[PDB]
Design a protein around this ligand. Sequence first.
Ligand SMILES: O=C(O)[C@H]1O[C@@H](N2CCN(C3=N[C@@H]4CC=CC[C@H]4Oc4ccc(Cl)cc43)CC2)[C@H](O)[C@@H](O)[C@@H]1O
Ligand SMILES: O=C(O)[C@H]1O[C@@H](N2CCN(C3=N[C@@H]4CC=CC[C@H]4Oc4ccc(Cl)cc43)CC2)[C@H](O)[C@@H](O)[C@@H]1O
Ligand SMILES: O=C(O)[C@H]1O[C@@H](N2CCN(C3=N[C@@H]4CC=CC[C@H]4Oc4ccc(Cl)cc43)CC2)[C@H](O)[C@@H](O)[C@@H]1O
Ligand SMILES: [Cl-]
Ligand SMILES: [Cl-]
Ligand SMILES: [Cl-]
Ligand code: NA
Ligand code: NA
Ligand code: NA
Lengths: 589, 589, 589
Amino acid sequence: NAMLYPVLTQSRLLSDLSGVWNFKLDNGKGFEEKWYEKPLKDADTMPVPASYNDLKEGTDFRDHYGWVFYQRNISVPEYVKSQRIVLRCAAVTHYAMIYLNGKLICEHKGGFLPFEVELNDDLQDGDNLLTIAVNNVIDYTTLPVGGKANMMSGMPQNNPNFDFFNYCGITRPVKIYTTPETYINDITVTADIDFTKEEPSAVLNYNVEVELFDEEGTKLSETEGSEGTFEISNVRLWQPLNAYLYKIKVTAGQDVYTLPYGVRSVRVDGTKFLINEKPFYFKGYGKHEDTFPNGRGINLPMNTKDISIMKWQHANSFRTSHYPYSEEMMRLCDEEGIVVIDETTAVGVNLQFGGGANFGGERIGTFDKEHGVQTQEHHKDVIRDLISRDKNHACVVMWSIANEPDSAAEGAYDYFKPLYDLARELDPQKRPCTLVSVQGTTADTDCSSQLSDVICLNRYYGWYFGGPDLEVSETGLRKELSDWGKLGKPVMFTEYGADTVSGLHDTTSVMYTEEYQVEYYEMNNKVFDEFDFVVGEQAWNFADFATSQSLLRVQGNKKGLFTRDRKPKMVAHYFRNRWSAIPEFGYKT
Amino acid sequence: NAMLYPVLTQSRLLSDLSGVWNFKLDNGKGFEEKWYEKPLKDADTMPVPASYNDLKEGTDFRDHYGWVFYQRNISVPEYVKSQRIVLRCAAVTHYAMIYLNGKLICEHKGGFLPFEVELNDDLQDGDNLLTIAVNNVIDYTTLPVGGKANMMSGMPQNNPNFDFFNYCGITRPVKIYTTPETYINDITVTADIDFTKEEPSAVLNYNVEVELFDEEGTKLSETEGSEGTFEISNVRLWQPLNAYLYKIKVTAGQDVYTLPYGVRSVRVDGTKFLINEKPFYFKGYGKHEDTFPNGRGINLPMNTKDISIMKWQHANSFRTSHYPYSEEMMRLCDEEGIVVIDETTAVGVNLQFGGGANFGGERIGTFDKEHGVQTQEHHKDVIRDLISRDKNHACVVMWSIANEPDSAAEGAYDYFKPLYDLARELDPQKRPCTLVSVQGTTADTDCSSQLSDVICLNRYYGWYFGGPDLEVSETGLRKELSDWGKLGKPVMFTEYGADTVSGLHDTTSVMYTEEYQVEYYEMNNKVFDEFDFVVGEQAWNFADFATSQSLLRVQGNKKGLFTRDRKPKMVAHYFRNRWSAIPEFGYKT
Amino acid sequence: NAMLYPVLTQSRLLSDLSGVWNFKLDNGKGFEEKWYEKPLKDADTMPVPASYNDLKEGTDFRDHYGWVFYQRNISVPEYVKSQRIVLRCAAVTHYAMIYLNGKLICEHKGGFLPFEVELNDDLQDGDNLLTIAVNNVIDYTTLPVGGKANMMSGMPQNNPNFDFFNYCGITRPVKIYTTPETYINDITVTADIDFTKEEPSAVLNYNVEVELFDEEGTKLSETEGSEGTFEISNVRLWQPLNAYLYKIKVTAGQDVYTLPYGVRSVRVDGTKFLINEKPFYFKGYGKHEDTFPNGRGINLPMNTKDISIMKWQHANSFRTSHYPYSEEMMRLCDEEGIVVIDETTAVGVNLQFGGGANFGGERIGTFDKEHGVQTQEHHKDVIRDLISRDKNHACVVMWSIANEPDSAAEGAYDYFKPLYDLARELDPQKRPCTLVSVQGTTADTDCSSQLSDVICLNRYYGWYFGGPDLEVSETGLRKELSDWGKLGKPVMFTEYGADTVSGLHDTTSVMYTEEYQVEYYEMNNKVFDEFDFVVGEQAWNFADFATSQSLLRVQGNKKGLFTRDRKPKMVAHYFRNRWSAIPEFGYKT
Ligand SMILES: O=C(O)[C@H]1O[C@@H](N2CCN(C3=N[C@@H]4CC=CC[C@H]4Oc4ccc(Cl)cc43)CC2)[C@H](O)[C@@H](O)[C@@H]1O
Ligand SMILES: O=C(O)[C@H]1O[C@@H](N2CCN(C3=N[C@@H]4CC=CC[C@H]4Oc4ccc(Cl)cc43)CC2)[C@H](O)[C@@H](O)[C@@H]1O
Ligand SMILES: O=C(O)[C@H]1O[C@@H](N2CCN(C3=N[C@@H]4CC=CC[C@H]4Oc4ccc(Cl)cc43)CC2)[C@H](O)[C@@H](O)[C@@H]1O
Ligand SMILES: [Cl-]
Ligand SMILES: [Cl-]
Ligand SMILES: [Cl-]
Ligand code: NA
Ligand code: NA
Ligand code: NA
């Protein structure tokens, strides 16, 4: 349930197992032949952490269907056996099956949130054979959802019901860390914060399942007990593009753990998004965890380079489309002060794409209880695990339950209501919750008008709908955006963009050129600025990223402001100039 | 002196400290203000391992001159203090200065080979402040050599006397590992190997400062004592493009260590390069450790992707131009069976570039003992550390003492003779030694004709010399190559190529197009095939890589067969087709 | 009816009116305000010949709907009025309306074949105001056919039912030439040719509505009368990639005209295409008249450069997709010996694209006699004018009645039968006739199985149908191609290809890369080579060309082997290498 980020501490080890491992694609006999008992024969090599799809050559390897087998020896000196020995998989995409010495000792479903297993038993002395089997199959029981054909259909292999590539393998690091036999399992810190003062102060309610410091390291307070409080006069507020992390050192019996924490408040008021009781405006992008050749595999240099590029562009936020990102990127946004919209793996809960699923002649609606999505029981686990992991991040400003689901369809409200409730139940900060809405929903039809504190739109007026007629597409966008203002809620665009192949130009623009992309964003942004209830623009996407092959995809999705190697297209200088004249707070009040 | 690659063992920990650290550029006051004593104020963030140059924005950051300060807290539980606690910096480019709790506890010069320091003392209990200061200054005392102007001169900042970018910072991982208070410090394994038999067998002399296994893990022998021997009948030979690693588990008192070892032989005979007493032919490239945005920082996914690309292209070798590569890439070449020419940091020992260095009107010759290179004392340490690190790699087939030095100049022979001798003294396998020769040397003038077992040429007939006249450049290449045959030694080309901007084409080629690059290699390769003493072609470069800015460099060096993101130019399919019809052994005999 | 190419002769002038003219877009009032009577006010400038769409900036100009007005003064000295003064418009796209001094004196429909008008009357003395009004509207009465929406529909403006841009304006030159009051109006020359001899000879039946020369200019024969004959012993055959043009100087009363003529024979025999009674194999492309910025406007330098590129690539043929090309390019193919498949303007006679045309709920079939295409009466004129213009070209080897019509639909056979009959009636050489068949037709369903001497296919197995699965697409292509062999007729592919953005690469190819395009053609060509009745491959397209904007078109059609500026993609070197090992005659017999 609780996943504290493993760190070197006075009582905890941290043996990163990352490196080149043994690796073999399953041919369909890996389990009956029980490869996880003996070392892998005729093995290949594969570095972890990384998606494996792009790391060898050949369509049979990249488009492989099914299982793969990682393997690696591990050994602990016996003087360490006095402590707990837990193996924490930061992510395994999609389905993991961890064997140790031939014995199955863990299973996990969901390829973007951490999970651990105790190793004290089953850990012989000497060299131990650790095998991790990884499955990539997606279907109606997985998040993200796998369809029965390509998303372009109707216009043995996986068929993503989502517009990105099904990168799989050990996406994030596999580490080993120790704890004493009586350990800290979780920490929770909320902040009630008094703004009546001219010099605002704070009250920090915590709850351990304890010392406070400042940015430098100066000790400022101490308290006993599992539950307690800290009172900070003249407290320093964590703010967008101006972070400040206090340090919280929680000493229990024979175990210490330190957690950075940012002091800030998040509150919706009418048509206004308030961070520290100031009217915020989102500037930024939907991102992907997508680099070359790591695939989805974690890349800490790119994370820092992306964040640099952001501050260069005068952005302040992004959403973790369309899955929870790595812990490291979350802590980084804490240090660098980048506003994050944390989103679940719930993309493709919408059976109107992919041509469609049919039964006895009739088309299957999304939430058909016997032939439709079978994802809600798992959809709930994800909301639980994601909020348990990221509950303490001052950068996490709003939760996103799903990306472009069948929001306006029969069965939709009953599907999302318990998920929205579960989200507000478990988030101790009671943060805003939302859903990122497919094109085609209206204020009346969208079940997000009821459940969500913020309306997040994905609209492509001037690309899919209207292109290349930007004049017509403008009056379309104004007409729908006007009608959204009647909810009295805040509206932001979480996706808008036009595919642009870097290098293509015309003085009289056509689609796919850099000129058109700039004109597209000019037209959209002009209409955004007309409505005081629009509190955010986030372009799609930050950077070109890989997808499944299709007529509609020119070597991936090309809607990025930057190329896959982070080089700027002309639009990136357009946005940099616009976002430079737009503040973080009080844009239009 | 001895650097065994740290691994998880039954007696040794491995706590990788890699992650985001604190980071600050020095402004010139970092040492008088003693930043290494207290946590860094106004700090930035930086991931290790990585070169820092490309990870923030701004020419002042990328072209920074001098020092930077990394910082990070470290903590070990006290039950671990019973063991040795050693901190191993895999590489720090260029000059490292490791402080702990404010106390200077290590220094190192040379930014591409490992170095460690004991942490048992100075390691308080609790949270310890670990600071690493990194200097990037290059001059006549450094390897690589820094000049006084750009290499294009004559046609406060560093000026590389080498054609690549001066990426600096913590290039390779920083880890912590433990050993018992009586530990293994080094292992050495040579192989005398009997080919008179129809089923060749082997004798494995080892020497520890002990059990044998096969590829799977089946135990095959055991022996007592520090020095001993193994006899393997029907031994399996490590071979190019067909690796096989035995496992050697050396158990000493309360400490175990495992080392993979490949059984093969390397011997020069006349005009023939023999691996396992067969006539080898080199196919491949000079490489760089260059990726985006890591800079020189280690990238294990790219290493695997590069090696995949190699086997796709039917290559078999590369040289580590122009510095020793990471341990991980060396072990990978052991697993994947890739022939490596291991090269020192000795590039730029040649003062005829960069316009030149002048004194009282007269130009300074390279090996002027008072105004020239001051590098030999350090040049010797590098040969010592590099051979101590890579002595056991079956993939390391020949050593390269320097890249394009002033090989035919006054003082040259006296400079290189002790280095060549030192190389053969310390390599227990007595492997071939060479020097990669600048253009302009001849068989008579090049001091490598005496010292080297293999003649390695860098020739650009059809680019720098002769372009765009490939007809003229051909008869130039034949005329010089003929004269090299009189030494009766093997000759390979370690560098040849033409800058090619991906995407530029003409049916009637001009320079910088993909057509010209292909025609260039066609002309060169035609002349190579005429001479039975040519035993290898290695193109320059594997991939486009970053350099200092200059009129002659179109956003880096563009001589790669692949782009910086490893996408193939047309020449890469040309070479793949040629190398497919050329075997590894017995090409022409 | 008869259009001899105007040339400088001993009795005929040739005053090319090409240059910058006055030009104005109609706003809807140009005719009621009668702009053709007085010089154009507020005029713009425009060069003729050229398409006007790309020659100014702005989507309103490029996508203009309706009329434009050209204007220019013309003046003839009165001593020339003793002769005929005829104004010959080589092409005006689409609908021309020629005024002189304000009086309407000609009209023409069809924007790709020549038409003339006599100027002896209405030609005052002094400066005469010549106005040409040009209309671009396309609909169900035009060839090419204009639809009611974009071709991507169902997945005030023109909507091409064809995949190229609707370039309009004075496409080809406007010239003035004179004749005496009793003139030559037409010349027709057929060749019966005796191959029983070891040194074949010829008989040249002519017919004027007369002297013979050879390549140099040596006179070889003479004859009187309108109808006559020439007997050439040891005649030199015009051949593919080896042209030879005799010269025919026809002197009548006070008028001389010279016409080049090539002696060759064209005959279908079973599954064999015979030129000079030898078994031919087509190598080449579907082309376009498309360059920058001329649009469709004639470009003689590119024609020569394209033909050079062809001979560089070892091509031998192309088709004039999808309209008759310029006279100059036809005469050039005579000189350079390039085999041409002459095709009419009949593209888009197929109402299954563009989403579709609907009436009372039911969809309109193509050849619905009241709501479908209204093109046959004009379709006949085009066949008449095209064969009258190009009847004498030895390079014109087969006629193409239409490109991808609804060949397998109700009403189709009755639509095409009179067109096919008309084609064989008026071609004195009785040359093969064909139809280029959309994907989806089979040997049974395609009405071209009956009417056509050669089966011409457009198939995209591995792009539109099957991509990116080339394995599956292969067995699809073999299965359909096998079934075509049962007609015992010759089968060639007039179109196959994959969109490829120059510069995109992967070692593991995906769609739109240069690697995929090469693999696509490898798979297709492998299946072509399996069937002795396949007598030709012609790739689509020769070069990237402009189209209307759509999601499916990355700045135009990118299926070219070369870019729009004729620079080669990787596939162009693939084809050059293949076509080099494939002869013109007797490929497989
Ligand atoms: O498209 C993009 O760039 C990004 O936009 C968002 N959505 C994508 C799919 N969407 C589609 N909407 C259609 C809308 C209208 C008709 C058919 C539709 O059927 C298709 C068919 C193929 C494809 Cl590819 C997309 C769609 C909705 C928008 C996602 O959040 C991103 O992950 C994605 O990458
Ligand atoms: O050049 C390349 O691509 C690769 O080739 C090799 N060498 C580079 C420098 N070399 C030069 N030779 C000159 C040769 C003739 C006249 C002046 C010379 O002065 C200059 C001036 C500027 C530059 Cl940039 C290069 C040189 C020798 C070849 C290196 O091993 C690589 O590291 C390098 O990347
Ligand atoms: O496409 C190309 O590159 C070239 O190929 C030929 N034809 C194009 C249109 N064709 C289509 N066939 C579809 C086939 C299957 C389903 C829908 C179809 O609906 C569409 C929709 C949009 C477009 Cl764009 C094309 C088509 C048939 C092939 C033409 O001779 C060329 O002029 C053209 O340029
Ligand atoms: Cl977003
Ligand atoms: Cl090399
Ligand atoms: Cl064609
Ligand atoms: Na975009
Ligand atoms: Na090169
Ligand atoms: Na093509």
